Design a protein around this ligand. Structure first.
Ligand SMILES: c1ccc2c(c1)[nH]c1ccccc12
Ligand SMILES: c1ccc2c(c1)[nH]c1ccccc12
Ligand code: FES
Ligand code: FES
Ligand code: FES
Ligand code: FES
Ligand code: FES
Ligand code: FES
Ligand SMILES: [Fe+2]
Ligand SMILES: [Fe+2]
Ligand SMILES: [Fe+2]
Lengths: 389, 104, 389, 389, 107, 104
């Protein structure tokens, strides 16, 4: 919805909405923190899709209010005043809102005001799943969470563990950094490769049949929308890198077979299967904070039937998986994303980029995202919708 | 139940007339063509008086921030307004306009 | 003029000039420092209404020149060179100017230049009153200083003492916070309230009609323009803050009654009387430096009949009033002003703000300022007025 | 091409191109470093005319490649990977280019890619002369280096030594700071003046014949274009600085006669003859890095007939000329250039500046530069030239 | 081989494009401008887009990915970001049948 | 006192002629249609020669920064010029152009 120069949008006819979605897609669920990070009665702040939000846990349930008073637009979080269990009072003129529905229920500075009961602060649905806090940054009653999650993430036996941080790049550069079969060249020296004895080529190149390697999913019963890049089953693993015909670098000839298939799903979550070990899966979100930043929400899933396994998995995670994979492997993806910022900062990169074969899957994602997103977030959504209808 | 606003002829089409009520919030009577309508005078977006606004057809634009309402349904017509305005029943009898004491 | 999106100005029909006055009002007197801060032959720099200025004291009298050489536009203050008592020579090409009228009287690098005596550096009137330095940031002959000062500030026996600092918020946010009848809520825990046994409600339940909420002064004997906050005339003070009918906070039940008289005056100075003690007054200016900052020029006045009383007052000021009131009370106003920056930084808050009853006082000020200001400062005044035939 | 507001360019009919050339002139040679600073197989990064470049030395010869991968536009220099002697491999997806012609010769992650051999990274000619590295930031076959160098710089026996650094000001402010006969007023207290017994007036003012003092050169056989300000033979040295007829400052009455003539040449190099000693010459470039910065490339030349004379000059350069002249004299020029930034930052300074007689030479330079430059560098050149059929 | 059979001249309306796939080689694109026929590589030289999926405006083909364009007669770039010329293949009509060269022109 | 400048026909309509005066600042004589006017030649904003500028009607545009003046009143017509130009009455008699020696 008009976030980019019109001259540029007219040029990218195949995926203009995607290029315009600089602030992310509205009306989708997004993970922003882990359940253990938000305690009972201790509001936490965060910015999602450019909007400042407040999250609080009351009687164990999470509630989300926009962190901007309706009166003079100050953030309530500058000085939090929760005077009753179910409400929050602005520190300025004491306009008081209910966490459950955002209604302005009282105003301490003028209990007779005509505004009481007649105004409502924006609220957003919040749901906890797999120890992760998801916020529906949208309007109207929310769709089921599964619609915006990759396959198997919500499986009963699937134990989820991970980490989250803020990275300085637009969310799309992160998505395309993750859903890229040839970028793993940057991970050729990661400690996970040797230390976990992985079989990892320098890159996965397009196999014989292109129509078989890329699988667009828009028929999932759950409503999921995404694209598969079947690199393992239809791609070609390049293990020997040559220059002028001379081998200058080789891939990893380990025993553990990983990354059989990768898939990217709206609103922007990647699934790598299996990874970082043959018996695990990696699910990572690239959540838009503002046009220049995103949350890099990493999670690793491993089936567990009992606490003894869960505890064992949790122990391995802290001692190996987190330090060796999430960090040891993905840390290079961080500066890689930061390195693409300049080229796309003026939006011109969306026109001047020179793609090659392995980027076919990314193009498929751009079209899927353009066609199936549930809304283009705009700066007007951030400040206040504007219209003369 | 009904208050005498003014003579239907005292209002030129496309004009607004504020109606103050004793011990109560003021109302706004609009004449769109040959029909009359009424809503609360105070804009739902703040403390502005709509009777001091500008009427364009059946839409009243608030003088403070430019928000607007359809005077027939009281529904928001322009941002930043979002809260429906309270509408009051109006009736013309013997050339004189009357407004209901309570919103319909 | 034309400092804000025309679409926004068209929307705020009640006070468009005020919203447009992002850089302040031109052709008004503004206090910028205290007399004791500038000594004989020691030029001082400062920025007022976006303009860099130089102030010097020669033979006891103050003079103000624009701190921008006519030649290549450098600030003369980068390397001050006052080679004779009545002039200042630019450090670059030696263009020399008279402090008295700003005339280019000499050019050391070209004594016979035809530009000599044909160009003039902008000068602004400067006046000292009550130990304060006021600059008339405007054109032509200045009006009496009395026009731009609150009643009684210039009274013969009024002893004025104060403090000044740079605050990071647009000047208007500061003005409105000061004149805001309900913002008193933020001062509920001030040390001044308890330590000086002040009576301080949390707010007011308005009484009477809209017209009775304020008293607009369109003309004084000297042409003053201002508004008095009369919310306490027919309004009910709120001492018990409730939420859902339950008491969650109470005002201060002190015996000392202060601030019974509150008025804001163009170009932007508040008068609170009496405050912070029954026998004194507070006059404070919110002076525009640039679009994002202002001078918070605070003063406290107490009538004194002799040098003994003035000495005693000076002692009380330094040991009690300054730390307990000017800082202990008003420091909270400082961060409150800063908290409103984001909402208005894109000029959207001037459209989206949801006001309530006590804001009648702010609306009256916005209208008065819009109707009686002596000119809108523009970036063009800063760089150089532009006009093409 | 549209680097500046058209309204402003239309106002400066005498030198619009010059005012538009905020990023510098394309299709000219520019010195960017000294030869001893770039070693065999040691890639070095730099920004010239807004473009990020990579320079490397292979078998002694210098090569220049645009530091931006054709694929996703990242800077190859983030993680330099020169797998083979003649190439550099992007750290991201491994696209590989030849330093010699910028041709994409290999792709380690997809050796079968159809892009191989059909894409080419931008390359720029590089030439080493007098121990200085010159890059032809232009397109097509380059002209002789001599065209963009001041007279005598390339003389067989001229020994060149220098220093280079990045200064925070647009290159034109630097050019006009150097080619300005009156600005030397700022150097009146330089240690060089007394320590090298120089005869230096407060400024050189216009003589009785302007057409004789300024000499526009556009008939040079090597094609160089420039302007001479014959301050020594046609100008008037001002030694007594007066204010109101009284002497407040005098120049230096040393014995060494320097600065007989100054000349500025496209693309932007000044020649001061003789300086800083009667038997030496100073040649300095103000190289555009981006719109706000430039390389201040200083060189001092002194004829030397053999290695003994060269090593002697080198020792004198390090012990005297560099600290006393290049630094002791020109250091004041640095903050002087920074001081002009504000006035010209909004491009308004090019309209509001008030010139005087001595600026006549600068005006001649602006005209010559507008008329004989070989191209206006634009932001589109930096991001990627654009054109619709 | 030398001349590849494409289709009947009448099977193409003016202003249309037809993709010609080839065994073991890159695809071609045949364009009909008026009653004349031209042909170039099908793959845009700026990336991986298929020009046969673009839009023909006279004798200029516009790539659907980034808006680049080429003159179908000369194969020269007509709009940025395209800079590399397309290979052009001769087209001839034999007894109402459209044939495209198997090898591009050398120049 | 008056200074004989030139023959009226020596100047084509819409042109400007610089008139030098030894020991004094040069003047600029403008021919607007068949009328003649005069002012100081030096722009009041710098060192530019107005005689080298562009005449549009009765307004001369400085060639340096686009400043302008009305050649009849000498008053600024366009920024950055702020200081009024010196005006010299011109008189045409028997086809000869004369300009006052002193600014009046
Ligand atoms: C190909 C192979 C592995 C990966 C990939 C693309 N993208 C990834 C993102 C996170 C973790 C692993 C991978
Ligand atoms: C006049 C006289 C000397 C100099 C000058 C102008 N410009 C200069 C720049 C560098 C070094 C010396 C000079
Ligand atoms: S800004 Fe929150 S109550 Fe006024
Ligand atoms: S008060 Fe009516 S639009 Fe704001
Ligand atoms: S910039 Fe001040 S004398 Fe030149
Ligand atoms: S960004 Fe360089 S090979 Fe992909
Ligand atoms: S692929 Fe054709 S313009 Fe980029
Ligand atoms: S010198 Fe005439 S407009 Fe500046
Ligand atoms: Fe990665
Ligand atoms: Fe306050
Ligand atoms: Fe200098």
């Amino acid at each position: 919805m008009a976030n980019v120069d019109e001259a540029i949008l007219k040029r990218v006819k195949g995926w203009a909405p995607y290029v315009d979605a600089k602030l992310g897609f509205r009306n989708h669920w997004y993970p922003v923190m882990f359940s253990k990070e938000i305690n009972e009665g201790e509001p936490k702040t965060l910015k999602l899709l450019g909007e400042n939000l407040l999250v609080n846990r009351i009687d164990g349930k999470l509630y989300c209010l926009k962190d901007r008073c309706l009166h003079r637009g100050v953030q309530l979080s500058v000085k939090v005043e929760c005077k009753t269990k179910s409400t929050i009072t602005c520190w300025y003129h004491a306009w008081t809102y209910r966490w459950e529905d955002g209604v302005l229920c009282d105003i301490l500075t003028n209990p007779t005001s005509a505004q009481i009961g007649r105004q409502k602060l924006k609220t957003y649905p919040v749901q906890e799943a797999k120890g992760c806090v998801f916020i529906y940054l949208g309007d109207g009653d929310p769709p089921p969470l599964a619609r915006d999650t990759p396959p198997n993430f919500l499986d009963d036996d699937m134990e989820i563990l991970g980490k989250n941080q803020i990275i300085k790049s637009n969310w799309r550069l992160a998505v395309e950094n993750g859903f890229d079969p040839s970028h793993i060249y940057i991970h050729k020296d990661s400690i996970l490769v040797k230390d976990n004895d992985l079989a990892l080529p320098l890159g996965f190149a397009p196999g014989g049949d292109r129509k078989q390697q890329t699988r667009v999913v828009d028929d999932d019963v759950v409503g999921r929308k995404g694209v598969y890049d079947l690199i393992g089953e239809h791609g070609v693993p390049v293990f020997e890198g040559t220059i002028g015909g001379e081998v200058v670098r080789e891939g990893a000839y380990g025993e553990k077979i990983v990354a059989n298939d990768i898939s990217i799903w709206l609103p922007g979550v990647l699934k790598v299967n299996p990874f970082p070990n043959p018996d695990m899966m990696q699910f990572e979100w690239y959540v838009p904070i503002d046009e220049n930043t995103h949350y890099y929400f990493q999670t690793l899933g491993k089936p567990c039937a009992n606490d003894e396994e869960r505890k064992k998995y949790e122990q391995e995670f802290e001692s190996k998986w987190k330090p060796m994979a999430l960090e040891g492997f993905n840390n290079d993806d961080i500066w890689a994303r930061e390195a693409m910022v300049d080229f796309y900062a003026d939006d011109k990169g969306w026109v001047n980029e020179i793609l090659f074969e392995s980027d076919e899957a990314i193009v498929a994602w751009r079209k899927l995202a353009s066609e199936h997103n549930q809304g283009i977030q705009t700066q007007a959504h951030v400040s206040g919708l504007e219209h003369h209808h | 139940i009904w208050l005498k606003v003014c003579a239907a002829s005292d209002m030129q089409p496309g004009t607004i007339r504020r109606v103050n009520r004793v011990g109560a919030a003021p109302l706004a009577v609009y004449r769109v063509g040959d029909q009359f309508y009424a809503t609360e005078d105070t804009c739902t977006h703040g403390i502005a008086s709509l009777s001091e606004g500008t009427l364009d057809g059946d839409v009243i634009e608030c003088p403070f921030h430019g928000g607007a309402f359809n005077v027939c349904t009281g529904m928001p017509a322009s941002s930043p307004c979002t809260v429906p305005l309270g509408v009051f029943e109006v009736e013309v009898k013997e050339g004189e306009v009357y407004v209901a004491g309570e919103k319909k």
